[PDB]
């Protein structure tokens, strides 16, 4: 949108290449994490937690 190019020129900021879609706790509820399970598809390298 207009004036955003001007704002970036003043601030020298770069636009994020990715978008935040992380999972977060619903509002108004608290608790403790007791179990974590990870499922992965065949052909995909597993990570340290897996």
Partner 1 sequence: EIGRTTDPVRMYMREMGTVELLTREGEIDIAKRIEDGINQVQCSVAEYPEAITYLLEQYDRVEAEEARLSDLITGFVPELAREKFAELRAQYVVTRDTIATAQEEILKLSEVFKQFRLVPKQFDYLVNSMRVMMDRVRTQERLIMKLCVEQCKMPKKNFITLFTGNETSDTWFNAAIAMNKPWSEKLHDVSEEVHRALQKLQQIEEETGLTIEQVKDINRRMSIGEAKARRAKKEMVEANLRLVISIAKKYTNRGLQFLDLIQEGNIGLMKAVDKFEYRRGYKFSTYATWWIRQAITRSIADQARTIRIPVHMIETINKLNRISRQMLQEMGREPTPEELAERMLMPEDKIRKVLKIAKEPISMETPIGDDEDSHLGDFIEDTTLELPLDSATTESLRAATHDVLAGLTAREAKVLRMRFGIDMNTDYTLEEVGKQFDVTRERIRQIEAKALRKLRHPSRSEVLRSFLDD
* Measured distance CA(28)–CA(16) in Å, rounded: 30
Q: Which C-beta is closer to partner 1: that of 20 or that of 35?
A: 20
Find the binder of partner 1 among 6, 34, 44, 50 (CB under 8 A). 6
Q: Which C-beta is closer to partner 1: that of 2 or that of 26?
A: 2
Per-residue x/- track, 28-47, partner 1 (CB under 8 A): --------------xx----
Assign 5 to helix, strand or coil: helix
SS (H, E, C) 9-31: HHHCCCCCCCCCCCCCCCCCCCC
């Amino acid at each position: 949108t207009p004036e955003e190019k001007l704002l970036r020129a003043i601030f020298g900021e770069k636009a994020s290449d990715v978008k935040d879609s992380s999972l977060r706790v619903p509002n108004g509820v608290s608790g403790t994490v007791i179990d974590v399970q990870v499922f992965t598809r065949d052909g995909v390298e597993k990570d340290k937690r897996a």
